Design a protein around this ligand. Sequence first.
Ligand SMILES: OC[C@H]1O[C@@H](O)[C@H](O)[C@@H](O)[C@@H]1O
Ligand SMILES: OC[C@H]1O[C@@H](O)[C@H](O)[C@@H](O)[C@@H]1O
Ligand SMILES: [Cl-]
Lengths: 458, 453
Amino acid sequence: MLEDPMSFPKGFLWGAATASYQIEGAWNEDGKGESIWDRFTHQKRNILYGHNGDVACDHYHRFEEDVSLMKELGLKAYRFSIAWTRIFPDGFGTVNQKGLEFYDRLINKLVENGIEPVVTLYHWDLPQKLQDIGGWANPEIVNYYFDYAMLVINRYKDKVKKWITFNEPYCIAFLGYFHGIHAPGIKDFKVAMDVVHSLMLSHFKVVKAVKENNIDVEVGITLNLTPVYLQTERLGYKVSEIEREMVSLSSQLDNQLFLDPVLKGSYPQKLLDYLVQKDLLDSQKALSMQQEVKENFIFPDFLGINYYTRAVRLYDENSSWIFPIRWEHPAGEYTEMGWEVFPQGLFDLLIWIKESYPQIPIYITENGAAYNDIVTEDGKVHDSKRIEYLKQHFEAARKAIENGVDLRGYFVWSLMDNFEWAMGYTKRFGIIYVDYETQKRIKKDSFYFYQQYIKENS
Amino acid sequence: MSFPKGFLWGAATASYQIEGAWNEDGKGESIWDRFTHQKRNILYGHNGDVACDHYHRFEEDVSLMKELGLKAYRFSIAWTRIFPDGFGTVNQKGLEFYDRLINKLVENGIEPVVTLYHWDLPQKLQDIGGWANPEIVNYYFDYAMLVINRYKDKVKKWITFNEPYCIAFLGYFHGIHAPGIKDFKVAMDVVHSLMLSHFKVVKAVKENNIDVEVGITLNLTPVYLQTERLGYKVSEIEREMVSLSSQLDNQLFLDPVLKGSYPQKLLDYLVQKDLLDSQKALSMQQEVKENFIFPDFLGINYYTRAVRLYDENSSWIFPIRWEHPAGEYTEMGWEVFPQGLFDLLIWIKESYPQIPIYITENGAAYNDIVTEDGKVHDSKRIEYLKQHFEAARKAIENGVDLRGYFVWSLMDNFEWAMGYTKRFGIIYVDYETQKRIKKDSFYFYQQYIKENS
Ligand SMILES: OC[C@H]1O[C@@H](O)[C@H](O)[C@@H](O)[C@@H]1O
Ligand SMILES: OC[C@H]1O[C@@H](O)[C@H](O)[C@@H](O)[C@@H]1O
Ligand SMILES: [Cl-]
């Protein structure tokens, strides 16, 4: 007998996500200090086409129009980040009132319109003045971050009930400090590992203070997770032990390095051991890292997940990577990022978290796709592939819920086309198209699709 | 709007990829027998010792061709089956194999098209420098003329080389193909040995009034600018540097083959970057000019395009990087882009002297699964072929002298450094049993040939 389909729970947070550097512009206005991304994009050869976020989507100026679009869409929630440099131009010291006033006005406008604000405290825009003294590799950054975080939490806790300490610490550490393709452009694995640990301790400090002081907000963190699959199993071959081990270690670096500390109070020990055995990490640091996460661990209120695609990997002795593995690209649909469209990966990932970690509310804090959108003569954007991407992932999410995953919300990346970091403006993820010459917002077909989807699933 | 009368609908294979019997009947060792027998060279330690065992099973395979309704079949002759040491003693068992294959093809009304060299140089000749040793040209020529003279009554189309780009750069620069050397200057030597080898064969055929056609197969990758995809203005430096990268892929072999000179701006760039001795640049142009002869046809292997853009940070020999456009990709990580085949063919027609063109390879790798009822529902391969057939048709409609189309491949086979992990066949091969299973694409193509002939 047909029992009602499990649907999205009541109160499920259908949302859209942005980040301060990617949309705000006004990079030097009203006392805002220089961020590491201001510095990074103003230097040669770091960004495609020499693009920068000086203006971006001009959201600092046009936020009222953007909240109006959010209201039209029927978003239950909006995830955005606060620019540390608008609050503390120098990272610490004097507070910039005009920065507070911007966020006061944005947050109030959201609440007036019935949209739940969800704030990312750190989405990659460290004050350049703190980078000048080591940045995340300097242990004292932990305290400067904490002071910033508690200031904005105490200011906005009446209206903002969900706080994300960090967006994607994997990217911050390894892209910012190992690969150097993101600000601050450093290229040193051991420094990247110091950063990993600084971010964890920062996170725990904020979670601990909210709990200890009985502040009525929820604190979580956002991790990018990329489910890893074996090409050997795709081919129907037998998997060797060495391949199983090496691919698993590569998966642990992507997926468990932050998940394990955040939810279980320890780093993945096999990965740390490997990194020590390959002289990529000092034994003394591996040991102290482990001791310190255990000492400081506290369980968060929710887990945020950024999901886009999977990886398919296989053993490769000849590889120049830190593990003897190579990637394979399975046949199928790919985005302008060269990312495989693989909704099953979202389902598999969510089931894996349910089965492998203590229960915790989960939010998908980012999911979306980049297509080379064209504005038609009638001023429309017929982004049918984006619609299909989103429909399929929404259904992956539904199915996870049907299997008892505690999913409480879903934030499309992005509300609007924006500055895609080192790729500049070349990658469009919006459900709203932004003409960068005029700053006109054009609703893509995906906007109308999402609007209807929310209506039918709330 | 129709395919011309007598259009050669075909399928293509290569000796090392299908034959097996790698050391039977006195066959010499090739650089691919050596390459696959060293560790770390091929995925999963795969080798071509057995492959599809076509050496033994060719009669079944020819019946499948007949069933398919192929007008033509492109295959390669293994030099090491004919001259085990590359020169000297002629092996009769080798000759007898190609005798029987060619006879069986002709008997079934299928036109044989022979690639003389599809990458399997005798190891004995590599021992003395291979394609970098100028004497190779004469060893190759003697092999070529022997087989041409033997089979010219039944084989009217001969391809000197399959993809000299791959031979030189993948074999002698990147070293991911046999013989696994990594030296760009040696690769440029190889480029030139291949061009002179080509001209020598074309010349002897025409000079001796041998009634066959001689061509060459080049892999061509049409190149597109990400900057144009984004609707931005193109800078002069990007246009120049991406253009140089396309010339290395495309014009480096086309220009000598059809026009009798190498692309000068590329040579100049390679000289400027100490990638090519100035002296060699000069001699290359002079020697190609002296030996140039126009061929009877051009073979094109087309699979995909490249989208490129400028990158000063790049570690490649040009300051460029690739972009991956949104769309469908194959198991090779290749964009499905049938427009690239049309654009490429219009470009050949507009840029070079008129010449019959054959698509000597086109196809796609998908991760084929045999169902529980013994079928393979390769609907994506069907879609791939359908769209590329339509691009070929559009090229004809627009005045391109396209005279045939060979699907890569008749059957799943050894995909070089990827081993057996990539399946390009319209026929599935179970390597444990050597069973051939017709994929859905087999019947699609069967029907398409009947409707377009
Ligand atoms: O690359 C697409 C998006 O991926 C997310 O993980 C990041 O948080 C965003 O800042 C980025 O724009
Ligand atoms: O990569 C697929 C195919 O591409 C062609 O260019 C080559 O001639 C074949 O030997 C190869 O298997
Ligand atoms: Cl309080």
